[model samples]
Target: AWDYDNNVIRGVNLGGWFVLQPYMTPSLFEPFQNGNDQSGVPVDEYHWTQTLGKEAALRILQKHWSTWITEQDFKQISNLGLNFVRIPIGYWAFQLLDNDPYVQGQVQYLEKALGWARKNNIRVWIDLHGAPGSQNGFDNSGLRDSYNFQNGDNTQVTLNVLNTIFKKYGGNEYSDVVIGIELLNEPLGPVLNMDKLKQFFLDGYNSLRQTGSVTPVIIHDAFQVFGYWNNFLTVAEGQWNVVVDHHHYQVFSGGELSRNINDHISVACNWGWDAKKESHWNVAGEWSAALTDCAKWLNGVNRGARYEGAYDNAPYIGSCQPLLDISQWSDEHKTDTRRYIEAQLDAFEYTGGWVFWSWKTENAPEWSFQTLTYNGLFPQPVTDRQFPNQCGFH
Candidate 1:
């Protein structure tokens, strides 16, 4: 259903599955730690896997893998006119240690999910979200406070997992449905260094090719600004189907949180779209409509140091000026939200298209594709449920 050579990638990420984030699905971690327990503090996937032990953790994960996303969900996604799905999974799922902090049966679940996607005729983009060591020292990496991807034998270990993935799915039964595979999600650029990161990409690309895998290989920009590394992977001999995965989120950094609706449109239209034009191989692998940097657990306060540090000193750029209580304005900003969503889709059209940060969430409407679509803030599927004209911009 997806023709990347001739179409844009209208997709959403299958988050909160192999990778866990506090804001995505807070309830999943209720057994170990409440998301609102320590307020500003955050919990990650490793917390549950490590504290719950093998038996307890396996039980919970088994249930999660079964219910989080199913064949029904695949149908719903297809019906929504989305043609691609970026599935985030940790490397430990494929290769594990005796004391690894993840369930072993994840590989089986991932394979099953691929089968479901094929059945639904949706293209699957397998993303290695978590590496051997924490990539960004963030909870989403399945572990935190550690960055060993470039240290000791961790780099080799991580590449091996990539090789295993390419070997298993590269030329297998599901290869047709599986469009591409990203080498790593978001490696810290400074930590890995451009040289190291580039080397890893080249090695992973070579490894995948040697293993008889021809699917496109994606390499993240490591949070480096767009256009920073253009055509870095373009070979002189011939064309290689290597893609650059760049995540665009205006809700995380300090400068981003300060921008208003107008600013959001400008950033997406000018900055984001222009960046895509600079490199044809790049794609917005992850992004969302949530303009506010405020975490969900904070309620409507937006009073934490995190928010202050990000938005306090920055100037507001939207006409809805004199911003206050971003949470309170949620219901009243439907028009603004709709325009913002449309503008982002329009901007992402320049690249390989975009995959929203998540497909669904418990309470985060701004982050959930289902919520946005149901609320009419996001575009709906056209008749016949086929890929909407020009990457779902219909």
Candidate 2:
């Protein structure tokens, strides 16, 4: 049913459920934050676990995993017309090293989530979000300020985690439900050593085939979209099934977040989802409706945004002290947000599909697909838009 050509992969990522992102659930990071000693604050999951210790971390995470995205959520996801769900899981869930402060038991919840997905008729894409070492040095990788992923045992263990997932989930009733699996989340590209990254992908491609499963394998473009991945993993008569996962977020850079809504739309419209050299599906695997970097703790627990120059308190654009409220947004504000959303969907409509960064968030409505759809900011019919052809169509 997930035939690439037949349908666009309209889906939402189940982020921060298994992997806790402070932006999605700020309350979890509240008690850990310390203005007195900024360095003591737990920036990512690793630090969060370390700060809380193994005992408390396990107890809290168990409660969170059980309640975060349940079967009811899967039902609602299907009701909302979303057919795919990308669940981000850490490497620790399947394999953990000695003194690896990360709490386990997430794998059991993963099984439960898959069961829910199968029940809801939603195709699942299991994403190994964080690796043994930090992949992108972002808190999203479960570690902040470290790109230590090497081309050794760390890489092999990650591959084993993927292979183990296939071995357990594949060739079963859940096999049909799991349409694909990502080799790794965002591996910091040539910075993480392109030679090693490419080799790992080849090994992963062969490993999946060796496991006796033909499930599609997805690879992250490492933030270097439309470059360094031309005709990668191509074979005679199409033997290997690979897809490039390119995550798009306008809030990361000073230049991107500094732009107005029109320019943001222009950039998205101009982005080549169908870049000429793309040999396989180039899916915008992670994207959002957010145009500003105002979400509190979005960069890190205590780290500020480049938007207002809050990182160093230089000050310029706008404020993020109180966090944004969509309900209080003006008519013009709401209209512009809706227009940007339309432009992104229309641009991604060119490819096999796109998955919004997340399905849920704590008060961050702009980044929350569920909240945006309910608030009338995200398009309802998906293709039948109120703002027609904002991306150079009219």
Candidate 3:
């Protein structure tokens, strides 16, 4: 129903709903926060399940699965002119082994969401957000405490889950609505074995094909964007379809935290160069309007901000409190913030397009694509822009 080559993919990620990020839905996790001991908050869903036990966890998560993103949200997304929604679901949704802490029933909500997407003419790109083992040490990866993925049967189990997804949604009935299935999300690429990760991509592609679904397959750049992935897949030679997923965020390092507003805007303005290199599949699958990682529990619940010098021996940059509520953003700050967002839009358009990091948030208005649009920060129709080409970095 939409044209990929003719238009940029203007979309938003359905984050924190199924994937369970503490930063997005602080209320879901607030009850678990213990006095002074942040660890008592159950850093990941594994700990959430472990802390509350399966029955109570299911009660909580099932309620969340229903209420977080409803059909009304999908209707609103369609109204917002978003052509796609990158739904990040953990691998445990499809398969669960003995002693696994994850609860089931996410798939039921997924089916309902798919029906809504189809109704609204919004394509769905299901992302395997978390793998068997923690892909990265981030809690978003299902388990937050480890990065021991891909060493054992972790990769194999992930493939099985992909196969399960293909069997269910990769059929003829849903083909029109489901745009593609991202093989894996953020596979810890900076230090992950390059060859091994590539093999998994190939294997995941085969799984989609074997299921007889012609849906495209997507692969993340594994934190290696610039030189590492120049024509790496070579997928366009004759292959049906494969997309290279790249995530852009400037809030990770202490150096990034210290950059002033223009520095951030200039860096974002330059990302078009990186997006232009790839032979194909250059989608910046995740990015946000967020300039500072000031959202509560953004780094992790109670971990504090790199800007505030909360973690590491890193020096203090400044206060994160003022940056939290967008209503308090000064006119100048909002002006530059809009510039930063528009720069990302232009840069992402250099290749394919961008799916802003998330659709909604409980309190973090900066990260909420929905809220930003209303606040006159993020674009409404996805094209109503102030800055056209003042774009920048990777």
Candidate 4:
């Protein structure tokens, strides 16, 4: 139950799908494209030979996630002093279609993921980025539904379904790994419903707590967009063990973001750090904007070298990861921004920690510092290829 303080947690979004390449690309992605997870329709209409039948999907659990990254990787993360890792899960991870339980193997996967964190002494934040309907428009969870909550089952049933997981693993601490379960992913844009959204958090907390699960429950702003602390002026800043869990994606273009990171960071810290007197306003998510071509430049240019260097890579068809012809930022700017991000990491305070917006994006580079070329199928990490790791960016 450590409070969100000046302790800064650092890490990258582990997108494992790129390794599955041909099975997860445009043909599969677009054909199956109904919308994002909230959009309940399966996006891949044509169905690839690889679409997970119950058996195949179950096998994916055993072969892919159940044993993916090892305890050593978690050890490396913990050794780096990163106390937290936010995991965005697809609805299919726990429950299959028609509300059937794919329980056993998935539980093993969850336990494996948790085991690594526990072994490494890190806390795990489980984010339901994809629910019955698409909360976002990406295929991370393999749905192509529009992010329309009002007209979708993605809201009520999805929440209900996820509650089962919350109840099951809410606060089972194995070693040092504590669970911080968020109610939903970023609930925003046209679907912003504060009252209902807040109720989701309250209900989730009260339900889990009834069973003696004291794990911290998280909820992002109604709109994932940051720099609007004024909007929260009237809301009780601290109620329950919740953190604000805000997301920031400054400018989509290189120059625009280069100019705006500081303002955004100031808003985030003020919103989170200074919102209410003696309250905890930790950012559950923060960093460079993802998906657009400008992400590299934003990541590279240490603009607001005071807050955390920003980049929240989303990389769907329209965002940060791939440098599509139209989305490409200046290569020179990209390199420069990368150097600046490492430098800025040194001084940023309230940023506390940041996890790239996803772990299942199509074109993200292995490490955030690298640029993705032609929707790279599998980019390897260039570790210690240091541009700079100075604290001046803070």
**Top model by lDDT, which number?**
3
> Which parts of model 2 are misplaced by more than 4 Å?
34-39, 272-277, 312-315, 321-323, 392-394
Off by over 4 Å in 1: 32-42, 297-305, 308-332, 382-394
lDDT by residue for model 3 (1-394), tens: 4455776788899999888888988887889767766767878888778888889989988888889899999999989888889999998888886799888888898899999999998888989999887788888998886887777888888888888888888789888888888888888876678788888887888778877788878888788747576555565544667777888899888888778987887777667785676567668889988767778888887688777788755678778888788888889879988888888888887778889988999999878997899998987667778876575343
- Which sequence of candidate numbers ranks them by TM-score, best first? 3, 2, 1, 4
For candidate 4, which ten residues in a row score worst on lDDT? 298-307
Q: Could you give candidate 4's per-residue lDDT for residues 247-337 as a string of tens digits?
A: 5554444443444434443443444343233234455464542323332222221121112233343222333333433246556435544
What TM-score do all the candidates reach, one by one? 0.87, 0.94, 0.95, 0.64
What does candidate 2's lDDT look like per residue over 339-379, in tens digits?
98888888887776789988999888878998899888888
> Pick by TM-score: which candidate is best?
3
Candidate 1: the clashing residue pairs are: none
Model 4 ranges off by over 4 Å:
15-52, 55-62, 66-68, 79-81, 97-104, 152-154, 172-175, 224-238, 251-279, 284-331, 339-348, 357-363, 366-394
Encode model 1's per-residue lDDT on 323-364: one tens digit a residue.
233345556577677777777777677667889988988777
Instruction: Tell me the number of clashing residue pairs for each predicted model.
Output: 0, 0, 10, 48
Q: Please say which candidate is ahead in TM-score: 3 or 4.
A: 3
Q: What lDDT would candidate 3 get against the real structure?
A: 0.82
User: Over all chains combined, what TM-score does candidate 2 have?
Assistant: 0.94
Every candidate's lDDT: 0.74, 0.81, 0.82, 0.48
Q: Worst ten-residue run, lDDT, model 1?
A: 382-391
